[PDB]
Copies of this chain bind each other. A is one copy, B any other.
């Protein structure tokens, strides 16, 4: 569906990030230079940006 997020919906997604509920996909080494995809928790720097945006709203 063609969807445009409205203001409250932006804040709901930002809230999930801030609360530590989201992950992101990165490459992880598995030996000798080979890598696999994996998910990690979203980093503090990103959570803080989400909080900073929430606090401005």
Contact = CB atoms under 8 A, between A and B. Distances in A.
Given A29-B34, A34-B33, A43-B44, A15 B11 contact: no
Instruction: Kindly report how many copies of this chain are found in the complex they form together.
Output: 10
Contact of A22 (B5, B7, B22, B44): B44
Contacts of A29: 27, 29, 33-35
Contacts of A42: 44
Contacts of A40: 25-27, 37
Interface of A: 1-5, 7-8, 10-20, 22, 24-35, 37-38, 40-55, 57
Contacts of A15: 2-5
A15 to B, nearest CB: 5
